Amino acid sequence: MDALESLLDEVALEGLDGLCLPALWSRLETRVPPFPLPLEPCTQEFLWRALATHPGISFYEEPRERPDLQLQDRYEEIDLETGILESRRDPVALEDVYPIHMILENKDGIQGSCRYFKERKNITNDIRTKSLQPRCTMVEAFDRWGKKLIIVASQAMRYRALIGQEGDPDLKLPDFSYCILERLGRSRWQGELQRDLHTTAFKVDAGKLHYHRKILNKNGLITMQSHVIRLPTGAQQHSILLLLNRFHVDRRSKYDILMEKLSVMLSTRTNHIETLGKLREELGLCERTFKRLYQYMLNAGLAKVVSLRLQEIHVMVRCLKLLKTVPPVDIVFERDMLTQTYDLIERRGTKGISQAEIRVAMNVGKLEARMLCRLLQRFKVVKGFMEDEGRQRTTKYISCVFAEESDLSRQYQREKARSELLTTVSLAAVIEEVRETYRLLKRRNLIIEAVTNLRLIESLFTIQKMIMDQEKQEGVSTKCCKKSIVRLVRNLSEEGLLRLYRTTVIQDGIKKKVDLVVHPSMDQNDPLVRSAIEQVRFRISN
Amino acid sequence: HCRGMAPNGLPNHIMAPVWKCLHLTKDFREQKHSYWEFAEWIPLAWKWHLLSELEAAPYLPQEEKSPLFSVQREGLPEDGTLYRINRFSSITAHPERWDVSFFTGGPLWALDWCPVPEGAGASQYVALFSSPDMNETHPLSQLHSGPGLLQLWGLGTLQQESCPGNRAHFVYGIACDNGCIWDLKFCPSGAWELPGTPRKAPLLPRLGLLALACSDGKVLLFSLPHPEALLAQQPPDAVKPAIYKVQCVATLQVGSMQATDPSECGQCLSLAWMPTRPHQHLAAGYYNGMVVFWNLPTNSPLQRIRLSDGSLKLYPFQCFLAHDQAVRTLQWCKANSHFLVSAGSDRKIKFWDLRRPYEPINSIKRFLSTELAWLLPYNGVTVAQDNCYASYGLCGIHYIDAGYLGFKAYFTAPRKGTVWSLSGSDWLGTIAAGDISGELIAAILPDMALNPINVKRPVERRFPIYKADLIPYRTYTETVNHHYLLFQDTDLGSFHDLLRREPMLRMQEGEGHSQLCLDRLQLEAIHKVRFSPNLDSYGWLVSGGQSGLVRIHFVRGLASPLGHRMQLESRAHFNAMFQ
Amino acid sequence: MVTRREPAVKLQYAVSGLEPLAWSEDHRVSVSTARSIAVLELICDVHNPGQDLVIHRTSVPAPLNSCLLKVGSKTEVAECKEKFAASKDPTVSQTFMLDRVFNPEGKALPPMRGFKYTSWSPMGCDANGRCLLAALTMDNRLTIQANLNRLQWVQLVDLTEIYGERLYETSYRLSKNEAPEGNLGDFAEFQRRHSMQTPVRMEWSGICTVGSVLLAVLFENGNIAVWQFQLPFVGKESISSCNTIESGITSPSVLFWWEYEHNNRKMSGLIVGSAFGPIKILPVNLKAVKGYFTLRQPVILWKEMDQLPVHSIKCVPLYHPYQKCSCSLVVAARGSYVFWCLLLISKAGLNVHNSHVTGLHSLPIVSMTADKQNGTVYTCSSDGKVRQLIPIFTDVALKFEHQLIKLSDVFGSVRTHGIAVSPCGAYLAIITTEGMINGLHPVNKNYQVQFVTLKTFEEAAAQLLESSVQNLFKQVDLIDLVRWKILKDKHIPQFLQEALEKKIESSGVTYFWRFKLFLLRILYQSMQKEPMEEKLLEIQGKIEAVEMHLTREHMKRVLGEVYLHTWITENTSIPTRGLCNFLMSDEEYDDRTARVLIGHISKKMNKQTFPEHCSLCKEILPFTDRKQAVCSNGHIWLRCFLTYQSCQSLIYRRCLLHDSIARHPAPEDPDWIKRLLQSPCPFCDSPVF
DNA sequence: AAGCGACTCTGGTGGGACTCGAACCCACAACCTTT
DNA sequence: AAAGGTTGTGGGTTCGAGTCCCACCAGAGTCGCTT
Ligand SMILES: [Zn+2]
Ligand SMILES: [Zn+2]
């Protein structure tokens, strides 16, 4: 790319909040591919004239001086063991140069973040004539305004810098989704991690960032990778890496480059077998690293766990072997769509059908099938039962001819009555007290039984394990999450059907979270919770 | 705004648009109808072959007798008897109220009045189709091409001296091998001539030109003789249901010369003739959403070919993809035939300029719609909805301006059920609509040149004609064995104290609150409604439905001295022109 | 032969208007759509290895303001509109309120600001060497658009605005004696004043000769406005005339230019087709240019008035093998048929033959394209059929033979809203949409542009070797087929290499050296952009060698014109002595013609230095190397690849491929280098802009 | 007074966007788990 | 004796569902001016 265009591109790769002059020189010096022309005061005046004479560039005074940029370099790119580790090595999270403040619903359609967007003033006509002749030298401009001089490229230039030449300018994006792009754009070759965007850039639910990120994936403006953060804990965290397509590079991983060497080694060894120690020794690897590689190769399905005697490799020796529904409805001319939809649901009968499965069967839009389900419920001809499957609390719809006899009805009615019994049987080192569907009522009832039969239960894992086995005996394929239990236990706490007591106990230089759950009839002073604390501390003792 | 009360009991500001529509319709037809068209397309006796009893048996609609029914008439003593009538037979008209009921043997799915020039005083006919089987139902996406019978029914002349003791007569039918008929349209004018017209023995005086939208994906065009001219040729001892096999004037279908590739268009769903002289274009809507136009007189070897039997096959001169889904209904503009409207199951109403088909004049996205009516004097169109997407309590019938006046849609009538069919009387400026509830209502529109938002209470402008109830006594025989149809007719003689009379309370308790029934055949449902287009009988309406009963009503309260005045003056002019 | 090319192009907005896809001589594809014109620019990218079509995307925005056709004073039109809308006659009132020409915006009418039609000029019409885009909205705003920079289209002129004013000044009379000052309050005159200036369709002429181009605009009433543009077109300044001819054709549907040559006599006319079916060639009786001449009398191609609307017209020049003379073939889409007519000048004058090729489609033809080099017709209908239709010469006139191409086999069940064909017939571009799925309607509609290979690689390679036009940019669509093969197989096919070496040996014109440079640069990208490193170094050495040869030939030609014009003793705009040194530097320079040329120049050259100075230093630039010059302080200035002057200006021109750079011409430059600076790039033949 | 045509004032629903609740997944330490 | 597959953990990912809340609708009410 040409030097003069690489300047204007860099000015457009910051967002609507643009650059200071010292930031611009820093951005050009840190450019990849390298900036063709060595910066010096006469050259910087020439580049400044290239900005002032360009009609799409515009200049503002912001009310306060901006911080100077950090050294952005995110990644370690070294190791003392074989290869190198390019995991994130954290700089200090100093006060952000570009804290985001989205320009929502703009009447001119210009988009991005700028904390001063309503407050800064244009000084274009002070820096240049309307005939685009520059009125100030760069040194005069920086003397007069300093960091308050902010350079911004026109929206057409900024959006072009995000989509490239192959991208389509006609595509409007929601303001939140556009502000994700320009948060990526200003990162250049080292994209923002999705973790960091929601945690500290946008400060939102991870669900919000994912939801708004969707459109950028759907239109294909950004590329997705898994990436690895090396914490000061020494442990390392998985997170998503977002790279704007211009800046996509296929990032490698230490375990990936080392498993490739093992894959090459085992695939070139004619037997595809070697002992772990030699697999280590040929790569110089420690067992702590290598056991990850071994289990990754196994979890990738590329190899199989094998053991052979030394006389068989030539005493048993551990080795690795490498090895690698509803039918569509024909709409009739002669009946209305409400009649025809009821005819469908009657054919399903006792099992019912979902709104999404109606939609596909009826060949209608999402909003159209929604209105069909609403009307048939309001007419009282069809009844809706919630059913949890997968991640989704769907509704299944059954005609009132069958609804009472349906398994969903019967199972729900049993667990409702069972719940009414289990509630009405209720009685009339430093502990802290915390603040419908068939399967959900089953899980509620099972916990209420447990706290009724075992007035204390020693951890949330105990609750999960019995629930997991109970659902596995029922044959449920989905596996209950810890968050689902603790949110469920929180619901029972607000209903007052149990206490959850939490603390950390300390013993022999180590600490354990306790998370006692107890029947409401006892407070944290009860000898039973004290006995539980003691018997936990005992088994935690060295 | 004109004050005072009309003698029929409606306010004059409510009746005044009805009285205006008489003159506007007369002034239009004088300019843009004609007394004779398509002079070559005249019926020939040798093209009409009478089927024997054995040959007709596959075509007759299969129910030999109606469901049992009784009619109660507002303010008369209760009848208490149950009627039941044979297929192709009629009860006698009620001596005071002249309603007639007749049975066609199957569920009525197409119906049109035979158009007759003003003042002619002719016998009045309806042509209709009723499906062969009461319970079979046909998919949209597939061609049917079964048998079916086109039925022509004479209603008498419908003069005041003729209505007492009137009966409908099944005059003849055409046995069609082209599947069920989804629409019927007669040529709007110039097709009819006096039955006394002297014509040589091979020829027959012409009653009309009738276009059939067939489920076989093609349009059929017939020229109809007057019945007496057929019966003069027919043997004297012939079978009394006169069923004929008839050669088309033309078969109209999508395609091109030597293009063997069968068209994707699917079933033909709706028709419109060109409303204005010489009516030379006919349009159809297709399941694929195309609107297709044929240039009926066309000599051109690229559009016309003559079959070995001598009938024409006509290929279209223009087609365009009007809708992204089946185009269920068309209306062609009367006031200027450069414009057409269509509605399709994508639930858009699209107005078109046929000079510039690449973009509609206006697309309004709405609820799913079944039929449209375009009354001559009003720039917009009144729409009947399928309820499956309307907000509960807001489903019904809407008038929608084409857009220049920019009014909001006018909610002319709330309905609980889907309105299956709609007809606007140009002569009356009133509209009538049939519901799966089995109720037939009429409504008077305001003068839609004026903003509808001033219409403080539209309920004063609507009234029921009748409601059919099933009275106990998902298939036809299981329903008929255990129910009968109670037809509750209103007193259309006047609208005095309307909002306190029981049929309005019954209707108002139906609107909004009543719940649709789905565990039955819908045997009460009404499927077609048609006001008479003729100035003679202009105040008459016909309707029919799932029962295969067809019922005729005279809306005496909307007939008026201006219609009588215009009938007498048109009679005088007609009697001077033809003798 | 027909297979899909990999990138489908997504469209954000509904495809809109008449015959909505077109492919320009400049390899920009425009689709007219409800909110923009999307322009797809095909680049034979030499900087990346991706096998897809490298489609650069730009768009013309739809206008923000609805166009009103001027029919009278702002007060008098307002009272007339009130009069008609309030009329108690159903016909007058509803005719006014329905017709969108009288009502381009309203309280509840959707604005018609999307595009009705688009047409691409010939090349060389823009201020750059590029073509202009004529764009017509559905509210009848006709505009000319250009992409002067790469990023943004700008409107150069609105022609409806000008024509409306000129009609108003002449009181809507073309002949001032011929018509009354008819009252605007009469609906026939009101409608006429709208109809007489509502544009239906439009086409550009070829380049007349200073260059000029015509634009003929067809109006609803059968008037045609023939605009004349001076070239390069820069706006209203370049509109040399507007002249209106009355065709008299009622309801004219479509227009195309006829241009023809016989015995080196130029002739031309306008062919016009009615929506009611007939087709007639008008003689363009009015024009100012002296080199062209016009047909003497109208000829009727189809007379039948059968009301099959003439939806499209195309024509192609041919040479008839048996009549042994040049002839013109006209093809026109009429309903579902193709009308064809062959026009042949002979001693008898025009000899004319016509027919309808029949059975093509069971629905009307929605678009048509002609392969200008062969007369191969393509035709399309919304059922997704596309039919290739090959003209076969007959002892007199033609026969057409035709075959369906199964888009089903490449895209599945599909609707097609338009087709276009690349200037060499290399690709067919198709506006695809979701088709009927086993008789069901598709739930959601999404327009796309998709491409299919019309030619095999071997035919594209052969046609490039035997190319009569011998410019690569005229043939981007063929060298893209060659590019796709090389990137796919990571080697140059041997027969192409051997044949190209034979052409370079036997003919050696710089076109073949440019073709070699293309193959080698695509080869370098193919092999992942140490035997691979040795191979990369080898072929990069070959690229540099042939790149150096093309430079030598251009430098020789530049000095080979400095010698011809008056000696620029001030050395004003060419580094003459530096170029002479660069052309004597090496013993490689065996070419005696260059050596004697620089001999004669160096005899004539001034002994005074007249050096080139670095503007940031006022210190000399030595002229060491082709691409760039440096001063002692270490500044780096690119050199103009057309004149080797250093591009020290803050704005300068860049090749379409960014492979080469050029200086802007300045008033100090003599005419001959102001002409030289209009050359295409010496390496890629692309516009240097 | 009785009536009219704007001008409000009041309960009800859907359109697209978006909160919601769930299982799913990383990579580590814990150690139960095995010859 | 003498040690590794097997598992639970805090946090992020993501998938389709139902929910939101504003604009719009249909009806009834207000009342300046007229009749
Ligand atoms: Zn310098
Ligand atoms: Zn170049």
Author numbering:
A (entry chain A): 1 to 314, 328 to 337, 356 to 459, 579 to 585, 610 to 716
B (entry chain C): 290 to 762, 785 to 890
C (entry chain B): 50 to 258, 271 to 590, 663 to 822
Task: Quote the paper.
Transcription factor (TF) IIIC, a six-subunit protein complex with a molecular weight (MW) of 624 kDa in humans, facilitates transcription of type 1 (5S ribosomal RNA) and type 2 [e.g., transfer RNAs (tRNAs)] RNA polymerase (Pol) III target genes. TFIIIC220 forms an integral part of both τA and τB connecting the two subcomplexes via a ~550–amino acid residue flexible linker.
We could also assign the N-terminal third (1 to 716) of subunit TFIIIC220 (τ138 in yeast) featuring four WH domains and one extended WH (eWH) domain to human τB. The τB module recognizes the B-box via DNA shape and sequence readout through the assembly of multiple winged-helix domains. The first step involves the high-affinity DNA sequence and shape readout of the B-box motif via an assembly cascade of WH domains. WH2 and WH4 of TFIIIC220 are an integral part of the rigid τB-core, formed by TFIIIC90-TFIIIC110 and the TFIIIC220-WH1 domain, and their conformation does not change upon DNA binding, suggesting that they provide the platform for initial DNA recognition. In addition, the TFIIIC-DNA interaction is further stabilized by the WD40 domain in TFIIIC110, which binds the DNA downstream of the B-box via a positively charged groove. Subsequently, the WH3 and eWH domains recognize the upstream half of the B-box, and the WH domains, collectively, enclose the B-box motif and its upstream region. K657 (eWH) binding induces the opening of the DNA major groove and compaction of the corresponding minor groove, whereas R422/Q423 and R401 (WH3) widen the DNA minor groove. Hence, TFIIIC initiates recognition of the tRNA gene promoter in an evolutionary conserved manner via a combined DNA shape and sequence readout of the B-box DNA motif.
